Ligand binder design. Sequence first.
Ligand SMILES: [Ca+2]
Length: 129
Amino acid sequence: KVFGRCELAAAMKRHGLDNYRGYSLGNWVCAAKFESNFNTQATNRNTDGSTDYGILQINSRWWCNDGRTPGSRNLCNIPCSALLSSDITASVNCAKKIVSDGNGMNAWVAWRNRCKGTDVQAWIRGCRL
Ligand SMILES: [Ca+2]
């Protein structure tokens, strides 16, 4: 499914993401656009053989079982496939757990490099939230 900016924003808000662990909605939309361009199916390798899945590019090295990732754990006790459905719910649940890992949203390379410390609310905006 490829979301537009606002569609995902409402979706993320509906799912409880504006200010989950103090991260406003704009943070969650920002990071998705740069992790996955809002493509719920987006997948990417990682140089270590792990794989990033879904709207927030959630990594099989730790967080989901894709059955083919060396030194990997399945901390969200979910198959990486579940992060790809047009339903963002699996992705949101794992990322709620990921952000409470104590690293916060720095879990997301793109959020840290391209969202952190910017006016993130410019991502929701003009959106019928
Ligand atoms: Ca934090």
